[PDB]
Structure formats: structure tokens, C-alpha cells
């Protein structure tokens, strides 16, 4: 099996730049007719896959000006020209010149835009759960720059470390930016059993933890 | 246009089977060459198996022998006939078109899930999100909705029904001990809501759920 390392695992970059991607395959990968089946995929964010380049270097049609193949012999390189915000994704090379085909294992294009900060938010449990016993309480950080952030649940200021859900969109083409979500759940019995909830989070955009709470009250 | 639509994702159990189609339009299946590449909840993309303009045959290592695929050019499917499917089998499948001789992947559908696991099917409970106090006076305002405890992926939701999708963000859906946990908000203008109507849309297939919830202003 030929196998293809890419290289950046993660490539951050700001917009206007340009972006290199390499694929290093661990054998030659010429198909016995001769060609080069050598291709590169980019998939969207809750989209498939598609097309870019094929044969090493022929842009599908449809494709924008500034992406472009390159290389030969185990050495294999995308090149982007002027970073677009919807140019944001997973990268995949391929290799078809050798049975059983493979993929590299990707490389994620990540846009590098100013720092923003959070809009955070907190919701009690609604009443239909709390009728169920169950008690869920929930944090967005939306919209927020760079992506590394850190929350934390107090309960009547004591922190809770249990029963904590956290998930985060990819990166929005839209505005360049992260957002995240956070679930606390307990019991109602658990919930009810005291007063003051809130949601706690260090992010670079603030000297200060930002707090977003409520009382059961 | 040219266009593939994968159906048959379904939830199997571990040794089970599962037949997948895909039906081509806007193109002839005969000529170009066809396959199945899949990709893992880890996201890594990973070739199936393939069929030739002249029906030959490839597979891949970890598949050859329990799945089959096919053509129909009469009627443009193709199928891929899973067996003893196991838990790496577990992924979303995408059929794809090539321009034989040229290009492996140049046309791919939109995928169908497949899921190989004991778990059972559960059907989500979703709850509406009101704002608590303060962040509800304000020049905007963020709802939200809860969907808990299903199995298994996907779901699908939206609010009002999908006219309103400016704003939005639904949350990737994160699994603890066979059941799944999802979410979304939406922030729009303090004189959107709760002047008109907010409403989250909820459908999960596997477990047959189709459910809506309106936000509703809060506070006893």
C-alpha cells in the first residue's frame, strides 16, 4: 500500500496569503499505462467532498484560478494562491496509480482573521425537562476568535466538573469565526437543590473570566 | 446537472447486512467508471470499492468478500451489498462518479449514513431554549434548542422550518454511552422576537420523529 503523508496536519493562515500543501507518497506512483493519478479533494464544512486537481496537475473545470498541482516522483504539492474565506476545509490528496487506492489523511485549512470575543448566553432547564427529572443547563460562546477557549460550570460559586457536554462548530466561512456550546446536566433533584448557575469562560479577548449566570429563582 | 443520491443508510448491528443504492442523473453510468468512497467519523476518507465502464471489478482490502457492487444501466444505480458488516464499517458512505482512464472522484452525491453498532434506536427529546433575563434586553437576541439523548446520527433540525437560517449555529452532534446529544441557537434582532414566531425543527428517521418546539418568552 502506498501510503501518503500530508503535510500541515493544520494549516493556519490569514486571508490574502497563500497556502502550500504537500503530499509525500512512501512509493513511486506511476500506473503502468503511464499517467499519474494523482488527485486533490476539498470538502466544505457540511458538505462532500469534490474535485480540485487531477493528474497530478489539471484543475477540474469550475475550480477557481488560484489553485494549482504540482510535483512528480513521491513529491506532490497544492498551491492556493490569494486565501479566500470559502477556501476553508478538509484537503485530500489521492493516489489512483496503484491498487488498493488511497487518501492521504488530510490537512485541515483554517482561516487567520482578528481576535473577536465571545457572545455567551445561558439557558435553565426548560420546563418539560425538569418534568422529566431531567435538568440540563446550557452555554453558547458564539462567534468567537481564536478557537481555544475555556469554560467552566460553578454551582453556588463551587465549581462542577460532572456531567459536562461540550461541542463546537467548525469555523464559519461567513465570518471567520468559532462558536461553542456547553451542557451541564444533572437531576432535578440535584438541580433544585441550589440556587446560582453560571458559566464560566477564559478566552484571549478578556483580562477576565467571562460570566454568564442566573438563579433558579 | 450532474447529480448522485445515496439512499439506504440505516443503523445494523455488528455481523449484520445492508444494501446501499445511488441513482445517477444528468449523465449515463455505462461509460464512466463508479464507486463507493466512505468516510470515517474520524474523518478519514477511504476508498470501497470500485466498478469500471467495462464491469470490472476492485475492492479494497478490508472489504473484499462480504460487499459486493453493481450497476444498473438500465436504470443508472448502482448498489453496493454490504455483509458481516463490523464497527469500522461505521461511516458516511458517498457514491461518486470517474472519467475512466482520467479521474477517480470527479462527480460525488451527498452521502448516506451508515451505523454498525448494539446500541438500540432512541428517539431524541427536544427542549426550547427562552433567554433567562438579560440576555433578552438587548439589540439582539439568542434562543436556543436542546435535542437529547438519541441514537443513532443523523438529525436534523432547523427553526421556522428553515426560512430562518441567518444567525444559526447547530452544534455537531457529541455521543455519550450510546446516546447523542445536539444543539443549536440563533440570534436575530430584539424586534424579531418574540414579535413574531420562533419555532425549532426537529426530525430524527431512524426512530421515525418529527417534532417542533416554539420558543416560548420564560419566567414563572
Known amino acids: 500500500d502506498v501510503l501518503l503523508t500530508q503535510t500541515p496536519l493544520s494549516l493556519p493562515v490569514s486571508l490574502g496569503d497563500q497556502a502550500s500543501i504537500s503530499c509525500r507518497s512512501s512509493?513511486?506512483?506511476?500506473?503502468?499505462?503511464?499517467?499519474?493519478?494523482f488527485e486533490w479533494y476539498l470538502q466544505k464544512p457540511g458538505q462532500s467532498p469534490h474535485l480540485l486537481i487531477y493528474?497530478?496537475?489539471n484543475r477540474l473545470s469550475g475550480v477557481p484560478d488560484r489553485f494549482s498541482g504540482s510535483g512528480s516522483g513521491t513529491d506532490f504539492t497544492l498551491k492556493i494562491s490569494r486565501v479566500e474565506a470559502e477556501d476553508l476545509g478538509l484537503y485530500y490528496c489521492?493516489?489512483?496509480?496503484?491498487?488498493?487506492?488511497?487518501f492521504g489523511g488530510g490537512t485541515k485549512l483554517e482561516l487567520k482573521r482578528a481576535d473577536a470575543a465571545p457572545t455567551v448566553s445561558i439557558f435553565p432547564p426548560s420546563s418539560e425537562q425538569l418534568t422529566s427529572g431531567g435538568a440540563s443547563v446550557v452555554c453558547f460562546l458564539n462567534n468567537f476568535y481564536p478557537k481555544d477557549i475555556n469554560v467552566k460550570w460553578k454551582i453556588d460559586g463551587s465549581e462542577r466538573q460532572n456531567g459536562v457536554l461540550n461541542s463546537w462548530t467548525d469555523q464559519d466561512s461567513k465570518d471567520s469565526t468559532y462558536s461553542m456550546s456547553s451542557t451541564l446536566t444533572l437531576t432535578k433533584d440535584e438541580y433544585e437543590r441550589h440556587n446560582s448557575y453560571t458559566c464560566e469562560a477564559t478566552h484571549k479577548t478578556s483580562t477576565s473570566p467571562i460570566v454568564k449566570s442566573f438563579n433558579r429563582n | 446537472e450532474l447529480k448522485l443520491v445515496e439512499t439506504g443508510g440505516d443503523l445494523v448491528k455488528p455481523g449484520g447486512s445492508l444494501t446501499l443504492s445511488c441513482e445517477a442523473s444528468?449523465?449515463?453510468?455505462?461509460?464512466?467508471?463508479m464507486s463507493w468512497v466512505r468516510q470515517t467519523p474520524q474523518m478519514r476518507l477511504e476508498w470501497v470499492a470500485s466498478?469500471?465502464?467495462?464491469?470490472?471489478?476492485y475492492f479494497s482490502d478490508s472489504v473484499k468478500g462480504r460487499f459486493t457492487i453493481s450497476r444498473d444501466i438500465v436504470r443508472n444505480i448502482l448498489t453496493l451489498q454490504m455483509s458481516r458488516l463490523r464497527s469500522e464499517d461505521t461511516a458516511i458512505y458517498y457514491c461518486?462518479?470517474?472519467?475512466?482512464?482520467?479521474?477517480?472522484?470527479?462527480?460525488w452525491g451527498a452521502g448516506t449514513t451508515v451505523t454498525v453498532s448494539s446500541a438500540k434506536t432512541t428517539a431524541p427529546s427536544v427542549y426550547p431554549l427562552a433567554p433567562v433575563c438579560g440576555d433578552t434586553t438587548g439589540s439582539s437576541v439568542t434562543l436556543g434548542c436542546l435535542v437529547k439523548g438519541y441514537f443513532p446520527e443523523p438529525v436534523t433540525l432547523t427553526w421556522n422550518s428553515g426560512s430562518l437560517s441567518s444567525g444559526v449555529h447547530t452544534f455537531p452532534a457529541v455521543l455519550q454511552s450510546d446516546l447523542y446529544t445536539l444543539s443549536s441557537s440563533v440570534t436575530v434582532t430584539s424586534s424579531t422576537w418574540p414579535s413574531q414566531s420562533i419555532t425549532c425543527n426537529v426530525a430524527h428517521p431512524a426512530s421515525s420523529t418529527q417534532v417542533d418546539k416554539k420558543i416560548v418568552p420564560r419566567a414563572a
Open positions: 461518486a462518479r470517474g472519467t475512466s482512464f482520467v479521474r477517480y472522484f470527479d462527480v
Open positions: 444528468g449523465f449515463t453510468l455505462r461509460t464512466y467508471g
Open positions: 466498478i469500471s465502464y467495462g464491469g470490472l471489478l
Open positions: 512509493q513511486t506512483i506511476v500506473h503502468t499505462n503511464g499517467n499519474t493519478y
Open positions: 493528474k497530478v496537475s
Open positions: 489521492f493516489q489512483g496509480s496503484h491498487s488498493p487506492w488511497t
